[PDB]
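Data availability (excerpt). All sequences and predicted token strings are deposited with the supplementary files. A representative entry, Leukotriene A-4 hydrolase, is shown inline so that the format can be inspected without opening the archive.
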Amino acid sequence: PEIVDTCSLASPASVCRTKHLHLRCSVDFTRRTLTGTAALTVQSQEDNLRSLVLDTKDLTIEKVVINGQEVKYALGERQSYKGSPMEISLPIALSKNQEIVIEISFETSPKSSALQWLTPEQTSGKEHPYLFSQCQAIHCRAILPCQDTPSVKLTYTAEVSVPKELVALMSAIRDGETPDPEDPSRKIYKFIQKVPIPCYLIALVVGALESRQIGPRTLVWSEKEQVEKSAYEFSETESMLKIAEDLGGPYVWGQYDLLVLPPSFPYGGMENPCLTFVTPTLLAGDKSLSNVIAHQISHSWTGNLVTNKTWDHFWLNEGHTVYLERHICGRLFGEKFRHFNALGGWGELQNSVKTFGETHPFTKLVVDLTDIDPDVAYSSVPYEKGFALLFYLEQLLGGPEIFLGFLKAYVEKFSYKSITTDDWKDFLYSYFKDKVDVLNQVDWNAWLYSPGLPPIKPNYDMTLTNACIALSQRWITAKEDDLNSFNATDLKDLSSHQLNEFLAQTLQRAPLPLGHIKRMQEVYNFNAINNSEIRFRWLRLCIQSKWEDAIPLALKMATEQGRMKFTRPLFKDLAAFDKSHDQAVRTYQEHKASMHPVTAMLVGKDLKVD
Ligand SMILES: [Yb+3]
Ligand SMILES: [Yb+3]
Ligand SMILES: [Zn+2]
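Structure token line:
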């Protein structure tokens, strides 16, 4: 049963495994480099181990010290997105289970793919710089030497030296702060993470941060300008935590903090232990986008406790988490809401399968990331095809209450471990041994290794969705002499979620006659709405329907924020519309240098430039 991590160039967990990382680094905004030492406590899994390989990517190694002496090490040739392998020669051969501490002096590249450095003008305060990291999936090797594979979990401690005006925060418990001995204009922030965790969950942010308490164990952090809005926006957090605890068991991380990042954060939320990172585009003003927090919260169990062994099994992380996420939404807003959201998820699977091609390898639940940059393969598939499979199983095995019992057992069984799809499927059969006849009905191969839409579609309640479908159908089948019958009251009973589903249903049939679009703005005035999810969908609709007036609005949104979920589709649609083509390219080239590194790359690919 050998399964290697094709995305790593480091020695596998079967040879040696990292037990603890003690980091000591200094943040240098003048050189945009992170400098310091990483002392790795490594444990051998083999007899007579004489050397080990680590992953690195654009790092400048100064020296490697073991037992107080400098040792030999070599850096192989870069291998694109995988980076360069760093082979270290141990001074003394190790026997099984023996441990040694290897301290490495390094420095990050200003162009590290895991970090984004912001000048004062790119922040809200305008007076200070700001730095933040993003390691998922494999950018940790770009911050420090390590076994960059989720098959290895470790604990860590850290001391970060930063300018005294700023504050530092990490995916761990705060352990105090003191003045920097070797420099009076700096402070040293200390942190401790006692729960073993894969290295892609290590995070760091340094900026002019303020905090405000919103719950017994929850603090919300951000620049002074966003504090008030953030404390209200995420006020349902403690109730979400209680429900999740009841669903998966005790929360083992201690603290659950929320940090609101700069507009340029590439994703909606990142489940970093003790410190979830959220995009500021969630500040809708009405708490309507809080399901992004429920998602992050769910990972404190599925994802952070039980982890995927290699990235080929990414669906194990995201599929269960979305499934739990929707149960939290079910308990807070009703079962009909869970079905509404679940059905929207199926639509999101249809769209993604349409965009890749029904036979595209990326539409497979379990993909083979050999020679595939994980950033490139990322999509809605593992989320929605993963969710659909669990929902289908739920209905097949007797209902939500019985499947939630398997899920809690699943978490207990695999806590602090890293698993593969096969491990999951074996425990499922073991947990439901009294219903194997049923389990033997599902087409596992089609579900797990076949591309395109799932072989079978679950059953969804339509209640909350019918209203959206109905309004969408009236607009699509409407002729010119029907436009006058549309009025602002059509929307009086629709929530923000139903308004978003209406646009999604209409976007799936885009384009629409240009006159219809003008009529829609005339009566529903969608140009005024600020809900980023609805605004994004409205602007795509306009652009795809060729309305020149929306070009500037689409351009503005595509660049004032950088959540890839919006930015990538907006640039792609502007590039496909002959009227905005030239300008979309020019805008990309002008903002490129100051965009998140990963986002620049992907947008560069979509537009096919450089
Ligand atoms: Yb302490
Ligand atoms: Yb007519
Ligand atoms: Zn997730």
